[PDB]
Design a protein around this ligand. Structure first.
Ligand SMILES: CCCCCCCCCCCCCCCCC(=O)O[C@H](COC(=O)CCCCCCCCCCCCCCC)COP(=O)(O)O[C@@H]1[C@H](O)[C@H](O)[C@@H](O)[C@H](O)[C@H]1O
Ligand SMILES: CCCCCCCCCCCCCCCCCCCCCC
Ligand SMILES: CCCCCCCCCCCC
Lengths: 100, 277
């Protein structure tokens, strides 16, 4: 009965360009057990239409999932990814950094 | 002598919450590309691509579904039955992966691995149940036990050594157009979070490329920078990938540096982006 906290990575499919439509991605991985909850946020408000991949896992058996949604980056509007998992005493928020 | 995925496998994730509450999630894959989904309620597969059935007939696809459907139900059932006997503490998860792959030369090796609590539990070497060291007594007892079932063993053998190979060649061929396509990457530079006063972090982004293999490095002229730190190759839901290559550098040494990207779709024409003053 191991428990592995999820690694969370946020990124846009294309380089950020205010105005042009893009794709926001939240890849969470290396976690175990599989039960998990992910949300893509916009200024703290969980986005509604978000797609995600069916569960999968690596060779080391740790699970991973891709959560994404078509989106348009503006000069403002802070996007992030929120994760709940048995390893986190409280949700974890990883903001989307355009220059990272 | 071809690019793209060279293997197929189905995975299984069975979560047991209590003695009469278990759920199973499964899917079919070509390396990291998902081609089959599995709807648990209706024990039916979900074909994600037009060519997901490979060269198999609708009749044989339905036979395989039925097979996985009863296996999924029976697996859950037997786990719940032997749970106590095997001294199992709820909740617990069991994972499985089985498939086959085409090696250069034409040989196709099959495989099957099972895990309990996120650790190896068993695997199938040369048609036999090989307990894993992290499987403890449990693994030895399960393998020793399972091999006694003529039926399930014969089915695992057929699926693994006859059906899987035949299926693989059929989907690799049927999905050739998508699997062997070449999509050029797009690169861009950015300034990452400063590693400290006077320092700077150079970030090179490469995205939208396919197939997966790719080469990205920070250069100074023709001299590769050793400090180049690759990030994980991340997925884009459209069967393309994303990768970062960073370099921790001093404010003054930035100018002169560049990011070089090589990818099979570039046909020798590498992408070179230079850091500007
Ligand atoms: C879209 C196209 C599809 C692509 C296909 C590609 C295939 C790729 C690889 C798949 C590998 C499959 C592995 C698991 C399948 C196991 C399996 O099929 O056996 C199941 C047993 O059901 C049980 O009661 C469950 C008890 C729980 C016990 C199970 C434990 C798991 C195994 C342990 C590993 C150690 C063993 C090592 C041995 C090498 C189902 O048997 P079925 O009822 O179909 O009878 C069958 C069926 O009808 C078949 O067709 C007949 O031939 C057969 O005679 C009959 O019994
Ligand atoms: C038509 C194909 C679509 C995909 C359907 C996928 C459904 C499940 C496939 C079966 C999984 C194979 C792996 C078997 C290995 C697990 C045994 C582990 C036993 C350990 C017990 C402690
Ligand atoms: C980890 C404990 C699971 C025990 C599995 C035993 C399988 C018995 C064969 C099924 C009878 C049809």
């Amino acid at each position: 009965m191991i428990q592995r906290t999820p690694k969370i990575q946020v990124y846009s499919r294309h380089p950020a360009e205010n105005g042009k439509s893009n794709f926001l991605n939240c890849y969470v991985s290396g976690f175990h057990p599989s039960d998990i909850e992910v949300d893509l946020l916009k200024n703290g408000e969980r986005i509604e239409k978000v797609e995600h991949s069916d569960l999968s896992f690596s060779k080391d058996w740790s699970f991973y999932l891709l959560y994404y949604t078509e989106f348009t980056p503006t000069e403002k509007d802070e996007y992030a990814c929120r994760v709940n998992h048995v390893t986190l005493s409280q949700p974890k928020i990883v903001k989307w950094d355009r220059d990272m | 002598a071809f690019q793209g995925p060279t293997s197929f496998h189905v995975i299984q994730t069975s979560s047991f919450t209590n003695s009469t509450w278990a759920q199973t999630q499964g899917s079919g894959w070509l390396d990291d590309l998902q081609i089959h989904g599995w709807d648990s309620d209706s024990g039916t597969a979900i074909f994600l691509k037009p060519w997901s059935k490979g060269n198999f007939s609708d009749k044989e696809v339905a036979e395989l579904e039925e097979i996985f459907r009863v296996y999924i139900f029976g697996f859950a059932r037997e786990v719940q039955d032997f749970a106590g006997d095997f001294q199992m503490k709820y909740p617990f998860e069991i994972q499985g992966i089985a498939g086959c792959e085409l090696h250069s030369g034409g040989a196709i090796v099959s495989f099957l691995r099972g895990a309990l609590g996120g650790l190896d539990f068993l695997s199938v070497k040369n048609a036999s149940c090989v307990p894993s060291p992290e499987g403890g007594s449990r693994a030895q007892k399960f393998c020793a036990l399972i091999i006694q079932y003529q039926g399930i063993m014969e089915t695992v053998r057929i699926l693994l050594y006859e059906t899987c190979p035949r299926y693989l060649l059929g989907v690799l061929n049927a999905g050739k157009a998508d699997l062997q396509r070449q999509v050029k990457p797009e690169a861009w530079l950015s300034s990452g979070p400063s590693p400290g006063p006077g320092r700077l972090q150079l970030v090179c982004h490469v995205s939208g490329f396919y197939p997966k293999p790719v080469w990205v490095m920070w250069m100074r002229g023709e001299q590769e920078q050793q400090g180049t730190q690759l990030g994980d190759i991340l997925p884009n839901a459209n069967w393309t990938w994303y990768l970062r290559a960073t370099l921790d550098v001093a404010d003054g040494e930035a100018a002169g540096l560049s990011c070089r990207v090589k990818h099979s779709s570039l046909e020798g024409q590498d992408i070179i982006l230079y850091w500007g003053p």
